[PDB]
Every structure is written in structure tokens, then in C-alpha cells.
């Protein structure tokens, strides 16, 4: 009875979570490729900062979305409206993807003053539609991410704690499985079959999630708003210019580590976007066995390799590291693990810098033409298997740094402020993505300039991206050294 009922409820919640994670990892994977493939093809780092700002907007709206949810509006209704806007955006995107609807919705180049000879005119034309789609999708997924975890949490919590542990083990497993399946199938479809259907499958996915969450609401267990103590912390902060001491301790303990982690999430999302771009400009193998115009090995498949290594490591990582690191001459602490993760990501960024330098030195001699997607990409004879080292380093650093940061944040904060520190974590991750996009904008602009070439759409093979990678690596190393120095005086 109760078993079956709560099981159906949490299974519906799990299906919605899997489908939303699937749609997210699907759209975010090949966004850079399609942003330069479609006739509104942007200019390289332009699409890179577009994806960076998308991720930053998601992670910035997450805390504000949770506040708005636990605010006047109802949590379940909040998730409903979030999924509605998410479906709106994931339906708007295939309209951009389909030629007829592309021409229809965006607008002809003769009306929006797009008569300038060059591909930049179509970009000026179709920029607002894509940006609106991106902002809608970002707000939707932000609210969904902020809301879905506490939702199933209270859905299961009523009975017992072991039920919550089992349900959230299932939650982690479903999230990772959805990530893997989405990456694989959706990226393969997008890159090797059709961008149209490649985006349309996320659409029907979001539709299924929305309808199952709507029909679940009838048999769900709703929860009235509690008060969203973010308003309390905001009131305290603006008036300063028993919750007082807890608030001040929580903030003073949380803000420094997350400030140090801001450049880390910067370089993480930069990993994502610019390594997708670099693999597009690196050498891609051929699956042309039964295929004409060979199916390309996806950078999203490389990200799947990363994530499946995360999956294989994390439990084994615990099981082997903990008992041995207990009796070790290299004893680990939360801050020391964050420092180790920062050093690993610095090494990965250095490796990426050397890889880009070698790629430039090689393309300076000769050039090949591998048609990834629907547009050609000039590349050099250097397989992308050299990105696997830096991807592995970034993955192990992900594990170390993020898990240590969350452990320290939770162990150094009261119980009630757990949602507040989670919101602040996602907020600082969004801040990191925004800082990354800003740094890219700064290195790209002609004011001082390191890689402009007046053409960044497909001619990045002459641009100096390795200088920007080394600048990011140097910033990360400076933050790591500062964290080391603060670790001494504390």
C-alpha cells in the first residue's frame, strides 16, 4: 500500500529528473557545433561564450529560482511553470533547427537590415531568437534543478531515513544513467544523422517529463511554502548596511572557499566549451564502415568517457582512498583535497595549452578537411586522443575538489542553512562561468588582443587560444597559491 504509493511517486519524480537531465546534457553537448553549423553561424569564441553564459545563467538562476519557489509561489506549481518554460524553449530550438521554421520564426535577412555581405548578417538577424530560447531554457532548468531535489526529498522523508537513502541512491544512479544515455544517443543523432531530429528528441523528452509530472501532481504529496530564509539573510545584509550569529558564521565560513572555487568552475565550463571546440578543430576518427560522410566521434562521447570514469571511480575512490589515506604520510583534509583538485586542474589546463600550441605549430605546415556536422572544419593531423589526459585530470579534479568543497561547506554550516549553502554554491558556479565568459570576451577584444584574426568562425587555426588557456591556468595557480597561504595562517 504505502510502499507501492510512495514508490510510484518517487518513480515519477525519478522519470522527470532523468528526462530533464537528458534534455540538458543533450542540448548543452552539441550547442557549440550547431551554433556554427546553421546559417546564423556565430564566430567561434562567440558560441563558446554563448554556451558559457547559458551555463552561468542556469547556475545563477538556480538559487534565485529556489528562493522564488519557496517564496509566495508553490513548489509544485513552480516546477510546473519551470517545465512549461523548458518545453517552450526546447520546442523553440528545433524551429531554429528546421529550415522552413528557421526562415519563418527568425525573419528574412531583408527586413532586419542583414544585407551586409558575409555570414555575420544572418547572425545579427537570428541572434535574438536563439538568445531568448537560451534564456528561457536556462531559467527553466535552473528552477527545475533547484526544486526537484527537495521535492522528492520531502516526498520520501515522511516515512523513514533509510527510505530517503535508498531513494537518493536511485536518484544519483538515474541522474548518471540519464546523462550517459542522453550524451550518447542524442549527440550521435545530432552529429551524424540530423540536427533537426537531434533537437526534436529532447523536445518530446521534455514533453513526456512535463506530462508525467502533471499527471503525478494528482497523486503527489504537496508541501506549502516555508518562508525561504534567503529573504531573512537578504534582510539582515541590507539592514546591516538567533539567526544573526548562524547567518554570519555560515557566510564567513562559506564565502572564501567558494570564492576560491569560482575560477575552478570557470575552468570547468571552459573545459567543456573550448575542448568541444578544440576537438572540432582536432582530428576526428571515422566510423565510415557502413557510412558515407563518416560519422564523427563526438566530443560529447569524450564527455561520456569522463562521466563514466567518474562513475567507476567515486565508489572505488571512497573504498580505496579512505582506509589508506587514513594511514598515509600524505593525510588528506577538505582544504587539502580542494588544493589537490586545483593542482590537477592546473595540470590539465597546462596540458591543454601545450596541446593547442602543438596544434598551431602543426597546422602552420599543412591542413586537412574533416566535415564534422554540416560545415567543414580545418584541422591538423593530430588525433583528439591527446585530449583524454586532460579530460581525465579534469574529471579526477572534479571529484576531489567538488566533493571536498561540499563536505567542508556542510560540516561548517548549520542544518537549516543547507539549502542556503547549496544555493550559494550554484550561484558561485554561475559566477565562475560568467567570469570565464568575461575573460574570453576580454582576451578576444581588439583592445589589447591575443586571438582575433578578424575571423574566428572557422579560422581559429591561426588564432592563439593557447595563450588564453595559459592565462586561465595562471589564474587557477594563483588562486591555488592563495588558498595554500590562507591554509597556513588558519
Amino acid at each position: 500500500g504505502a510502499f507501492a504509493g510512495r514508490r510510484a511517486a518517487c518513480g515519477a519524480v525519478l522519470l522527470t529528473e532523468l528526462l530533464e537531465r537528458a534534455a540538458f546534457y543533450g542540448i548543452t553537448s552539441n550547442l557549440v557545433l550547431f551554433l556554427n553549423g546553421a546559417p546564423f553561424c556565430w564566430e567561434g569564441a562567440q558560441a563558446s561564450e554563448a554556451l558559457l553564459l547559458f551555463m552561468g545563467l542556469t547556475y545563477l538562476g538556480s538559487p534565485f529560482g529556489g528562493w522564488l519557489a519557496d517564496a509566495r509561489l508553490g513548489r509544485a506549481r513552480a516546477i510546473l511553470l519551470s517545465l512549461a518554460l523548458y518545453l517552450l524553449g526546447m520546442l523553440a530550438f528545433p524551429l531554429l533547427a528546421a529550415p522552413a521554421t528557421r526562415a519563418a520564426l527568425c525573419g528574412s535577412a531583408r527586413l532586419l537590415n542583414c544585407t551586409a555581405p558575409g555570414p555575420d548578417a544572418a547572425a545579427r538577424c537570428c541572434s535574438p531568437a536563439t538568445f531568448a530560447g537560451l534564456v528561457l531554457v536556462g531559467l527553466g532548468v535552473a528552477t527545475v534543478k533547484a526544486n526537484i531535489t527537495p521535492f522528492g526529498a520531502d516526498q520520501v522523508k515522511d516515512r523513514g531515513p533509510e527510505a530517503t537513502r535508498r531513494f537518493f541512491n536511485w536518484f544519483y544512479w538515474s541522474i548518471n544513467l540519464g546523462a550517459i544515455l542522453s550524451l550518447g544517443g542524442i549527440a550521435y543523432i545530432q552529429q551524424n544523422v540530423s540536427f533537426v531530429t537531434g533537437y526534436a528528441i529532447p523536445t518530446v523528452c521534455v514533453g513526456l517529463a512535463f506530462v508525467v509530472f502533471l499527471c503525478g501532481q494528482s497523486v503527489f504529496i504537496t508541501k506549502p511554502p516555508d518562508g525561504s530564509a534567503f529573504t531573512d539573510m537578504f534582510k539582515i545584509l541590507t539592514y546591516s548596511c538567533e539567526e544573526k550569529v548562524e547567518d554570519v558564521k555560515a557566510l564567513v565560513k562559506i564565502v572564501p572557499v567558494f570564492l576560491a572555487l569560482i575560477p575552478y568552475w570557470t575552468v570547468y565550463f571552459q573545459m567543456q566549451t573550448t575542448y568541444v571546440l578544440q576537438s572540432l578543430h582536432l582530428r576526428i576518427p571515422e566510423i565510415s564502415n557502413i557510412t558515407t560522410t563518416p560519422h564523427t566521434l563526438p566530443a560529447a562521447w569524450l564527455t561520456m568517457f569522463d562521466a563514466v570514469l567518474i562513475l567507476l571511480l567515486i565508489p572505488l575512490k571512497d573504498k580505496l582512498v579512505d582506509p589508506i589515506l587514513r594511514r598515509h604520510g600524505l593525510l588528506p583534509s577538505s582544504l587539502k583535497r580542494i588544493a589537490v583538485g586545483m593542482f590537477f586542474v592546473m595540470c590539465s589546463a597546462f596540458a591543454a595549452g601545450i596541446l593547442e600550441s602543438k596544434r598551431l605549430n602543426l597546422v602552420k605546415e599543412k591542413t586537412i578537411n574533416q566535415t564534422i556536422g554540416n560545415v567543414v572544419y580545418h584541422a591538423a593531423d593530430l588525433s583528439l586522443w591527446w585530449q583524454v589526459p586532460q579530460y581525465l585530470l579534469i574529471g579526477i579534479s572534479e571529484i576531489f575538489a567538488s566533493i571536498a568543497g561540499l563536505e567542508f561547506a556542510y560540516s561548517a554550516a548549520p542544518k537549516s542553512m543547507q539549502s542556503a549553502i547549496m544555493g550559494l554554491f550554484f550561484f558561485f558556479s554561475g559566477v565562475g562561468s560568467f567570469v570565464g565568459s568575461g575573460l574570453l570576451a576580454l582576451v578576444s577584444i581588439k583592445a589589447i588582443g591575443w586571438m582575433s584574426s578578424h575571423t574566428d568562425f572557422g579560422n581559429i587555426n591561426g588564432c592563439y587560444l593557447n595563450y588564453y588557456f595559459f592565462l586561465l591556468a595562471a589564474i587557477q595557480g594563483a588562486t591555488l597559491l592563495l588558498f595554500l597561504i590562507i591554509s597556513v595562517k588558519y
Binding site: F168, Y172, I175, I310, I314, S402, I403, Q418, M422
Partner: peptide, 14 residues
């Protein structure tokens, strides 16, 4: 990002 898993997790394992 990819570990939102173990992160909600810390939360409740807690």
C-alpha cells in the same frame, strides 16, 4: 556539474 549526483547525496546520506 556531472556530480550533482553525489552532491544531493552528501546532502541526505548526511
Amino acid at each position: 556539474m556531472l556530480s550533482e549526483g553525489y552532491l544531493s547525496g552528501l546532502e541526505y546520506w548526511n
